[PDB]
Design a protein around this ligand. Structure first.
Ligand SMILES: *[P@](=O)(OCC)N(C)C
Ligand SMILES: *[P@](=O)(OCC)N(C)C
Lengths: 535, 533
């Protein structure tokens, strides 16, 4: 050193880092990108828990995003922004256990609340380095310290032979945990406050956040939580030990491969081979089902999430949870026949009954009859616009909206402070057709405040709206309360409670308060439908 | 010695009485016998035609009420008493009444035939609310009502036996309908335009004449008020009828022939004493002796018969009241009384549902609870009390009606449907019960036109409307008033549009779908649940 920017040299437990000064709309930020937090999980370490990163010599260059974890790359719609935005934007490699830090410039003198992002991607994709997770705006505008990590997805992060030493499963969850530990020990170097760490994540990121809520060793590593459109409970976020064993051994068969012999053989397989067969192991044709997800191992997850939400003590917990207007529309184009991004997708009753078997793949004939009976509009039972929307509702409700209600309910009753939202604003830029409304993931760019970049084409009300949301989020991280402590003018977001079940609408209009989160419909999914699966 | 009051029917001569209605005189022929008294060896037997009589039979007074249970739940309360027998009980009860305009119509007049309800265990054609003087006078209708056997006497069956074949109460009705084909012309009725109407078990009876071929030649149109032949309460299987019959026998100290002989030796009231101890479960809106699927009167189940029948040349008017379920809650659901407001608890609601849906398995019971609970206020007692009412009304009346209306329309019938929402000002039941079943009858019959009865002046205008709808329906097959416009028309009920009208003080409002979501539950899902316990 000697001739370079003094604000950009930091020491962490493993060594020296050089960050980069970055432009935000309203001024500069500090970014430290691609800080390794684990030994590269390669070679004999594939399928295994992360090991802490051994110290390095010299000044590690932390000025660019690092590798993205090895994963499936979607190609359904080439050139199409709506899908491309989620695709890896750095080299795919198994050597991907890196994390990123954004802080103000200059770094703050007093310790600042830390927000840690956990990306979604169904546990088979994702990357901390996508544009919509750019931490600079929350860093520049709200003075937050934002941290995001890569964690292993797909087989690499989730293939499990439960009980074995060499593939215990949940290791992707462990990468996340290791990055949380890294934050505890090192964030202060950046002016972060380790005693004020808030996890936020969306979809599998949200289910991830909830796993950490439910898993004791993770508990001491954060104080507050945000789950956007995802839950640790529900039909897709976990598999049983048996089922995980089953998918793992099938995948092994499909590629050539006593648990030791099998795993050892899997370890000799090229990464692309596992990705090529990843999708062939699901018990039924489905949507919103993923092959390698967190397992109920009786270790990380001591019991099913359903059990742990019911019987856990959430005394100390402030939690923000919510959903987008159309949780189910996105995946309809991936595998319900009838549906497409390129037309209105008006479907028939026949296509709807078939769609229900696909969106609720674990349902018997009777259970499905019940779904179809519930969501049919008996005045207009053949009406293709309603059917198309009912198909979206089934998928959205079953996988997200009702799980979120089950979670919000149990948490509030076990003594947690819960704030709930439904996000209803469709981006003016959005490239999915109108019929899809607000698909999951499309609140993210607002929360992170991307509309503040005047080069991005958002409307002026969208720029103001983004600021509102960044304020809710960072207020929540600061205090456990999304409300602005002075500003009593603006309508208050009340806690969600079992008695009143209040939540707010997030759109361009001021906060409006509503009651019951699809209460009638969720009684179907959460209370009735389980029992109809004891017959 | 008025010649207007003197008529020769096929069996001989009758002398009527001149009665007064608010706007003029009416000729009444009360207690005309249409069958041999069904007594002694005729108990449980089909009715035989009344033998001809000498001289002039006095038909100026209501005859006896068929032998039946009498309600004593709230002794001296007008709400219950208005349904109790207003004449002596007797097995000698097969009589009918005819009201006609005074003087007797110049040309053949459409006939309405009324069939009382009472759960097939009670009722009488002589109650004040079935008084036909108003329809006869104001609208010029020829109105006929008959007594039919009820309880064990009308409905006890040992199916297959010669001596108690079941459905005789219904055959009583059919014989009274035959009597009308043969005799109504003498009173200036048109036997070629006969319209049945009935309420509750009476509506079910109307529905069975629809589904029973030999009855079809005896009327041309039907009105079913708050009841249907299909659904949980109106029929029983042969197996189940045999079961209750043999159990009633055992209970009163008694091979088919031998068993019936013994039953015939018992005093009427001994049978009635044990009428209510034969039901398989604690229940409400369930009744021991009801029509039986006998392969004779009813060739198959009413469900089977409405799914496949051909109803091309049939006009039908069907409807329900706003609160079909409130009435029976006080008769055996803990927490319910007419005296307080019956704000019930959640536990009372779950136990109330096993009583309201007695044939429901544990899982089906739960589906119902989970459906009818308002999840925004799971434990509010007002909601829970109203949901209880709705479970019972929906399961027993509204959804069966929706089902019938759909089937009839799909299979060629011309159907009109209604919900009745006006609570009578004079009603003596508490407000929480709303509009209980049967409290439309007094309006259709035109009782508010009696200045002495203390109905509001709006209620009188309402009653006039209703009488016009019903009699227009009898005249033409269509309840709409030709002379009259814009304001608005009553559209036929169809499977596509599902249009019905609200009947209340405001002008007709057209609505679509009759508890459409909730009836999909009862009519489509619930059978599947139970079938797979
Ligand atoms: P989420 O992670 O969204 C991206 C696939 N999810 C739908 C589980
Ligand atoms: P309806 O006949 O009325 C009985 C008092 N019924 C509810 C079956």
């Amino acid at each position: 050193e000697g001739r370079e920017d003094p604000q950009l040299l930091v020491r962490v437990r493993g060594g020296q880092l050089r960050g980069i000064r970055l432009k935000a709309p309203g001024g500069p930020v500090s970014a430290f990108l691609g800080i390794p937090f684990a030994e590269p999980p390669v070679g004999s370490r594939r399928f295994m828990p992360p090991e802490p990163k051994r110290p390095w010599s010299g000044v590690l260059d932390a000025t660019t995003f690092q590798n993205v974890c090895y994963q499936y790359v979607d190609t359904l719609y080439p050139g199409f922004e709506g899908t491309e935005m989620w695709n890896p934007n750095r080299e795919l490699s198994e050597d991907c256990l890196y994390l990123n830090v954004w802080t103000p410039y200059p770094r703050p003198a007093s310790p600042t609340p830390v927000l840690i992002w956990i990306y979604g991607g169904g546990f088979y994709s994702g990357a901390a380095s996508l544009d919509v997770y750019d931490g600079r705006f929350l860093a520049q505008v709200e003075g937050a310290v934002l941290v995001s990590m890569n964690y292993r997805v797909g087989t690499f992060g989730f293939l499990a032979l439960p009980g074995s030493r060499e593939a215990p499963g949940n290791v992707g969850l462990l990468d996340q945990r290791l990055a949380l530990q890294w934050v505890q020990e090192n964030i202060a170097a950046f002016g972060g406050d380790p005693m004020s760490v808030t996890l936020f994540g969306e979809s599998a990121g949200a289910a991830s956040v909830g796993m950490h809520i439910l898993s004791l060793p993770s508990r001491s590593l954060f104080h507050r939580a945000v789950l956007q459109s995802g839950t640790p409970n529900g039909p897709w976020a976990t598999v049983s030990a048996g089922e995980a064993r089953r998918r793992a051994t099938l995948l092994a068969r499909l590629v050539g491969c006593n648990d030791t012999e099998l795993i050892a053989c899997l370890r000799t397989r090229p990464a692309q081979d596992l990705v090529d067969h990843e999708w062939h192991v699901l018990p039924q044709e489905s949507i919103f089902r993923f092959s390698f997800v967190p397992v109920v191992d009786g270790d990380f997850l001591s019991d099913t999430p359903e059990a742990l939400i019911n019987t856990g003590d959430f005394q100390d917990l402030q939690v923000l949870v919510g959903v987008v207007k159309d949780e189910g529309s996105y995946f309809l184009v991936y595998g319900v026949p009838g549906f497409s991004k390129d037309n209105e997708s008006l479907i028939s009753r026949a296509q709807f009954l078939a769609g229900v078997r696909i969106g609720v793949p674990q349902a018997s004939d009777l259970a499905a009859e019940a779904v179809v009976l519930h969501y049919t509009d008996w005045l207009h039972p053949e009406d293709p616009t309603h059917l198309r929307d009912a198909m979206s509702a089934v998928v959205g409700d079953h996988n997200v909206v009702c799980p979120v209600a089950q979670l919000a309910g149990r948490l509030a009753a076990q003594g947690a402070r819960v704030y709930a939202y439904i996000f209803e604003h469709r981006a003016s830029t959005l490239t999915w057709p109108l019929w899809m409304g607000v698909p999951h993931g499309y609140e993210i760019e607002f929360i992170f405040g991307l509309p503040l970049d005047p080069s991005l084409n958002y409307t002026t009300e969208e720029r103001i709206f983004a600021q509102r949301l960044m304020k809710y989020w960072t207020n929540f991280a600061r205090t456990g309360d999304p409300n602005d402590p002075r500003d009593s003018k603006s309508p208050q977001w009340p806690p969600y409670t079992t008695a009143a079940q209040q939540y707010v609408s997030l759109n361009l209009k001021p906060l409006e308060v509503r009651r019951g989160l699809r209460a009638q419909t969720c009684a179907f999914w959460n209370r009735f439908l389980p029992k109809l699966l004891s017959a």
